Symmetry: C3
């Protein structure tokens, strides 16, 4: 079938499936943001999708970013009616450096880049264009609810 | 079809689909509990559901709570036929204030309320009735496993 | 089919197991003994490969016991159709560092204290070969061609 995608700015990029049978469409950052230990942000994708009713999108981590960095993405449940900007819900869960500073910053590959500041160690720079998350779409069941006193069939 | 729900106490609320085409059902806390930085708890819903065979429940965060507070909910996999009280598996992942106390507490909206004690900064109070989590029901594939020496299709 | 092929990569490997015929997932066992101290991160090998067919994704995910009773945080892995690699449990010990308090026991994945081979920092876990650390839940996926549109039709 087809999934409609709107790009909402010049900074947006069509999501992308790595191989032909891969679960997820890789999702790209539309923003450049510095995120220091213990900091939280919603990173904009500048992408809207129209998931049909009877499916849910799971906006979720990539295992390389996840395993190799302190960047923790809380999986977002994207409803069928939602035509807004998909935001990536992120925390840098590194423990604070208590003021050790260094001239480099980490990127989402776990490598060190040149920065515009001498920044606290454990700080990441997410750059516009970074392949930061993925979007997996799964069918759902959304029945009517019946309150009962008894069910019937850690 | 229909999903059966049992309210297990007077503090239990029915799960709630917010908007017409929402994936899941919002789940309320049946307890009032303080959760200071780095603390963990299973928050009782006092609700049981009966997910049919062929499905799993995902008992998961709401994006507002998740993004605006330090309350981290670990997604629960709710098996068909689990008829127990659904527990919300939660951590306050704020780093401890090292002794700094404030007369307010945070709630799940990110906002400050009067509290019963002067409490460590970064503490949340979860109140009975708070819309804390959500439940999304997905079909599953549950095959027999075959051990193979080599993969063959 | 209603068959999933599974390939054990070593003698430290254990066949995944369903807990009841009503359970969503297959319990997945550690193939390695690893110590994980507060704030540390690792990918725990299972020495299991699976062949998830096209149209599905595996979700390599926490068990509620381990998760609620310990500081071991497992980031849910999205296991693609046709990935025949070693399944890796992406794990962090998210306890805050005990700053040099050491004790003769270590924690296990059940929240209990075991004798260990070193006097280690308090909050450290020992994950043992054969521990039932995660589960795998397999769900159908929707993988449509994306259509970029100008307008659709928290
Ligand atoms: O990580 C996320 C999560 C959600 N979203 C969007 C899509 C989703 O359909 C919408 C609402 O998700 P939640 O229901 O998880 N948030 P909450 O329940 O706090 O807000 P609302 O009152 O709108 O349902 O927010 C994101 O862009 N990224
Ligand atoms: O966040 C959760 C997760 C699970 N549960 C319930 C429903 C689920 O069917 C049940 C078991 O889930 P797991 O299989 O993840 N727990 P574990 O494997 O530790 O226990 P068991 O041996 O009972 O399967 O616990 C919750 O109430 N909240
Ligand atoms: O926790 C995990 C996650 C993934 N995996 C495997 C299975 C999956 O099919 C593969 C890649 O998953 P991602 O797409 O999340 N990783 P990434 O996007 O960083 O790498 P790739 O470039 O391989 O897509 O790694 C694990 O063994 N454990
Ligand atoms: Mg990938
Ligand atoms: Mg909602
Ligand atoms: Mg289990
Ligand atoms: Mg933490």
């Amino acid at each position: 079938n087809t999934l409609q995608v709107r790009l909402l700015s010049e900074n947006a990029r069509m999501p992308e499936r790595n191989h032909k049978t891969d679960a997820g469409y890789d999702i790209f950052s539309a923003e450049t943001v510095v995120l220091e230990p213990q900091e939280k942000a919603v990173i904009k994708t500048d992408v809207a999708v129209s998931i049909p009713e009877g499916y849910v999108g799971l906006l979720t981590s990539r295992s390389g970013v996840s395993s190799k960095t302190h960047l923790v993405i809380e999986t977002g449940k994207i409803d069928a009616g939602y035509h807004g900007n998909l935001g990536i819900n992120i925390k840098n869960d590194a423990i604070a450096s208590n003021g050790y500073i260094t001239p480099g910053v980490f990127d989402i590959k776990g490598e060190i880049d040149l920065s515009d500041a001498i920044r606290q160690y454990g700080t990441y720079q997410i750059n516009e264009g970074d392949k930061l998350a993925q979007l997996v779409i799964v069918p759902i069941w959304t029945p009517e609810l019946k309150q009962v006193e008894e069910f019937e069939s850690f």
